[PDB]
Design a protein around this ligand. Structure first.
Ligand code: COA
Ligand code: COA
Ligand code: COA
Ligand code: COA
Lengths: 387, 389, 390, 387
């Protein structure tokens, strides 16, 4: 039961109300679905199932994963469904597609994630009727994506809990963000994102989007320190050291190692192990810590065996706590930047960092890799990759 | 790897804006999660993951499956997530939880579905701003749950295509519906739903109300009143409110573990999962989805259609249900012996686990050895699972 | 010039989300407009202008007063318009229609008010767009009708201000409310509302329903159940849902013409408008508006308070109504003889003309010569009108 | 009783979602109320009543006329109320305030209109509850301000009916619109709007003292390239029709004897007024019978008029009005009209009264006439004589 990633692709990460301001998530998803089939030389008729993670599907219609699969050219014989583990949806969907082939219930799976947070609507329950008084139109992006359902405050407040408990100062979080911007800004000019990015044509004059628009040029430590806190009047999490609201999609083509050998495909890597563990919702940013340990234990690897690490940077506070506890070399963690600079599409972030992990391992010849993210509500997910 | 269903439970199916009119889906889910743990003698601290299918989670908060697990008593160390394959979500989640234990990544899984379509809100994209003119507040239940995203018409229109293609008259669909109502009315009086139903406490402010009976079951469904109804989707069609399933709320789940685990704990499971399958079809005739799904599930299990002792085929529409029983050709006396969704109700996210609950307890109640549960899915898909006692 | 009220009519006052839950205000207005023409023997083609007070017209369309006139049969040559002085709109519209005839710019006026508080929609400004976060859908009835724009609290809080300054206890307000219910229930049983009420046919989906009785009047209002209610505006206050007027729908109007015109047509008018007045007060105690308005009206008419034979003072709240009767000092036995808005209902835009209808028909049945109608107005205003019989 | 206009003032007319995009109507009204008081030397404590026409007050609060009076300094002893006769509201309020003094029920009146069409909200009746299906959020500006309640189509459709019956071609309407822009742009450059306009401070603070709808260099070629805005094969376009605008205007009314006792030189004497209704299909023909009734009530002939202000709701309705009555077009809208200046529904009636009054004093005209059309099939006119 050896499962490999034959190919992977992702769209550029768009800013909130930016290039993808009016593009539904399934429009970004099918472009990625068509890319992983074209990059692997596999026809759409051979896909058995499409598994796309999505957190904000309100208003898009019946099963947006089916719409993305039908629009990419996957025939009606295949099936499609969506799943939601918040920020780990994109990565958990890859593990779920791996289990479909491992149990012998499928041969070729397209798994990933898609998210259009700009298209997230405002909602309100109006069936019972409002007899008298004002009622609130709730932002589904904030309520169903960014607000803890057990304590009522934003994910940024949970990052404040991580910063206060781990004793991470404002200057330590800002320096981590600037380092993420500098690595991401360098990677874009050097063209290290060109392989993983598939261009998306926004048919409006038509506009082709093939570059992450969240990268701001010349991020200075001085401009980072002038920002006001966004969640606590005297807090430490700001707009600079926290991930933003973004749109995008990413996916991967899954098949057995024997199947890839029969088709002459050179896969990006083999999925050797995965894990998901839950933590206290107050400190949801610490999720990747027990998940990465469980994944490495299942793979038989030590922390020193890792050659490349992709840890999602939801917040600068949560990212500092993860790298210090596990103790892995920070020079191999997010070599090309993180979500603070690239963007954070919730449903697609799991597959987004998997794309960056896969293409960078082949680019520099890394043998062992690990991708992990934190999940709102107090959870984590991790996956071990071997080239 | 042999995976068994150690226990199962479901809430009563409530009417649209009825007893559960103001109850969130995760509150119905938490009751079922606690029930399957109590009925199997398994503590909440041993659950590894909770998998709940849900189609309409807008406005309920971050990951309602996590909320249902935390409120049911499952500790924070465990994980939870939701999935969406429309009407087959409740049953696919059970197959997904079965795969978690088969691959050795988990030991005990709570899988099922929950749906509160009464709590489904109206929405509208307003970030760009409406400079001038009227805009529509869209019903998320209709848009994301009941409308085909490729052709724009309701699921009832796909049933009209099935009825015309299979040449099913208005009288044949009404006769199937009346049979479904009468079987459900008999099952309710005989108490055949008491074992599977777990009572839900509607915690109100002017008195608590206990719900332990499906309120959609209509007493004395007559063929004359069935023929008096108007078509609901085509001005000259055949599908009416009587021969079609309704809008409902409810939750259902099952406790999954290996056969060795149940033997170590002295647990007597309700059944072993022998096979499952999911196939896609044309969205125009999505009601024919269960036909190739049942064929692949039986083919994967090594069974023939004649080997089945009990059959649970979800009755999304009377037209779609008649075409399935006619194609496969199994004995209709073993299909939905206690009624179907036409009489009980059709909570989209929870229907897959709902009919699995009725299949499991009825197989135990009458000593059936082999069973099959199957549903159709909007967009042109089907899902099926074969159960052996 | 001498302007008289040739005829008057009003619909039954409907409960909030009751019989008129889905009937637009102009549908109730058209019924009343047709009634005052039939009761006076005046054809619709003779009306020069229709003046209808309305406070909550959002969502009803372009100028609902014009819609009510066109549906009642008033030809397109005539004009129609709406005005808004809150709770005094129905009565101010009559004074405004009288001025149209006084200045010689019109001959026959249909003036009154209409209100459908059940049909008042929720609204929100969405042109700029909500980039991120929740926004509020505002109840237009609460915001534009029942909330003071200067202090932000409900009209019921202004009644609490009146109760504190006049030292009106909960027991006195409850006793005033129970007395209002018993007078209204007695008047309804005796049929004293039949003349003023015109039946309204609720064109529904499963058959037409005729409404000809005020449905807010509850039979057998007890002081014990009144005292068990909780305060509705202050957690430790005195104004409750029982001693305060409710949310209601309805319409009322009158046909105005000169005394010489009515004499030429052989019409016996209901009364002569002798004087009117409107004065403003502090918005904190808006319920005291009728005190300076009634005095200014009596001064303009040359009357003293003792000359009045009948008084119709709108009962917005039990606190404001008790403070008005104590200041002016008129005999309470001649004030609201058939009950008030606490029992009948308070459709804001139409209440001014509603109590004018009750004053006019009660003056004719008992032979009263001098009458006065007055109401309080949100924001700190009052309006009053003096009527003399013919 | 002879009633005069002691003073008049108006704000600059703002574009839809322009300088007044977030300014409530009563904020514009208070500025105008304070202006007419200062220009006449009359204190706010002397005002008896404020009468402001307003058509779209949804969401602004209880009686916006009272809010404008309280903020302008008018004491609580005075009264205030709003009225609604659509487009003729601003001018009818002046006639109503004139009647208050004629009957001896008031001495000093501030009458006019105010409108903030940008602040008009979307609404929907939700008390009964929407059990199932989609419902519409209704634009109160379109529904309660611009849509005929008897035939269901826009006011621009009624102008199409006017154009067909009088046989007014597209070229004639475009030439009328361009002429209106050129007259308004010339008057602005020469400063003929400076006297009537009171500057408004949009609280960086921004001072607005110029009508922002006036476009410099309006060409006939770009006018003819525009598409019809109400009928796919119609003749009314965005260029030959008035727009959606915000603004306020008012006037100070008192008896001629009162002004003489105060040493005030009035802008004019109100000699007559009239309002007549017409068929709602051709509501633009309202000024035709209304102006005749006003002239008949004043004892004047059409040839006696020295200056005319006829609101330009549409180029089609304005051409039909000038042709029927037959007055000299060289004395009609000498400084431009609503096609170039703007058309704030509640304030347009008083807006053209301001333009008529200051232009009559500027050139020494003795007799004037202001008139507008009203949705639903009505018209209003007023005759002014200088003193
Ligand atoms: C930033 C956030 C908190 C919302 O605040 P926001 O108003 O939308 O942020 P904006 O970009 O619109 O404005 C931020 C300001 O800081 C400035 N700024 C932001 N990042 C900066 C940087 N890195 N360097 C310098 N300046 C910066 C922006 O230009 C902007 O300027 P302004 O003061 O004129 O507005 C949003 O990113 C957020 O909600 N993040 C949560 C992500 C999350 O929780 N994901 C869940 C996974 S746990
Ligand atoms: C069919 C549907 C439109 C029904 O609409 P509905 O009008 O709200 O259904 P209701 O029962 O509330 O109203 C139906 C009317 O017929 C009556 N009626 C319905 N079923 C009846 C029956 N079986 N016997 C007798 N009378 C019946 C009802 O009492 C009601 O009375 P009314 O005429 O006074 O209104 C809706 O339930 C539906 O869309 N179902 C399919 C949803 C779906 O897609 N499910 C998943 C399949 S993929
Ligand atoms: C006072 C007010 C807030 C009440 O809100 P409400 O929810 O509609 O009050 P309700 O009538 O629906 O219910 C009140 C309760 O008291 C009871 N009650 C009301 N009046 C009663 C009476 N006269 N005697 C005995 N019991 C009474 C009702 O039955 C109800 O009990 P329930 O809830 O168990 O059924 C509302 O009527 C209001 O806003 N009034 C303002 C009037 C106003 O401002 N007018 C403008 C003039 S300035
Ligand atoms: C006609 C109306 C719909 C305007 O159309 P609109 O949707 O607002 O579109 P716009 O106003 O932004 O103008 C549209 C285009 O015409 C162009 N245009 C407008 N006026 C122009 C002019 N005078 N000369 C040349 N070009 C012009 C604009 O630049 C714009 O070009 P763009 O689309 O590339 O940005 C609106 O102004 C209206 O309804 N007016 C009627 C008001 C009314 O009836 N009041 C009641 C009277 S009784």
């Amino acid at each position: 039961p050896s499962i490999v990633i034959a190919s992977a692709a992702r769209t550029a990460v768009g800013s909130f109300n930016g290039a993808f301001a009016n593009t539904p998530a399934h429009e970004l998803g099918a472009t990625v679905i068509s890319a992983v089939l074209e990059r692997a030389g596999v026809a759409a008729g051979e896909v058995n199932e499409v598994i796309l993670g999505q957190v904000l599907p309100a208003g898009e219609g019946q099963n947006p994963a089916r719409q993305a699969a039908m629009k990419a050219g996957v025939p009606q014989e295949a099936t499609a469904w969506g799943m939601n583990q918040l920020c780990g949806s994109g990565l958990r969907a890859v593990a779920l597609g791996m289990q479909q082939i491992a149990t012998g219930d499928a041969s070729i799976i397209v798994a990933g994630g898609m998210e259009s947070m700009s298209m997230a609507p405002h909602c309100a329950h109006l069936r019972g009727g409002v007899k008298m008084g004002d009622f609130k139109m709730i932002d589904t992006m904030i309520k169903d994506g960014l607000t803890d359902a057990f304590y009522g405050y934003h994910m940024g407040t949970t990052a404040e809990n991580v910063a206060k408990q781990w004793q991470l100062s404002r200057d330590e979080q800002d320096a981590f963000a600037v380092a993420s911007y500098n690595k991401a800004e360098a990677a874009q000019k050097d063209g290290r994102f060109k392989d993983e990015i598939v261009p998306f044509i926004v048919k409006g004059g038509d506009i082709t989007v093939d570059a992450d628009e969240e990268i701001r040029h010349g991020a200075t430590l001085d401009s980072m320190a002038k920002l006001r806190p966004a969640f606590d009047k005297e807090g430490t999490v700001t707009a600079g050291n926290a991930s933003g609201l973004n749109d995008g999609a990413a996916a991967a083509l899954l098949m057995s190692e024997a199947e890839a050998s029969r088709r002459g495909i050179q896969p990006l890597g083999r999925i050797v192990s995965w894990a998901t563990v839950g933590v206290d919702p107050k400190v949801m940013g610490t999720g990747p810590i027990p998940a990465s340990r469980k994944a490495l234990e299942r793979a038989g690897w030590k922390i020193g065996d890792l050659d490349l690490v992709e840890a999602n940077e939801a917040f600068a506070a949560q990212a500092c706590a993860v790298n210090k506890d596990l103790g892995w070399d920070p020079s191999i963690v997010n070599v090309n930047g993180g979500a603070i600079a690239i963007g954070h599409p919730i449903g697609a972030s799991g597959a987004r960092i998997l794309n960056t992990l896969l293409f960078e391992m082949k680019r520099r010849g890394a043998r062992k890799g690990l991708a992990t993210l934190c999940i709102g509500g107090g959870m984590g997910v991790a996956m071990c990759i071997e080239s």
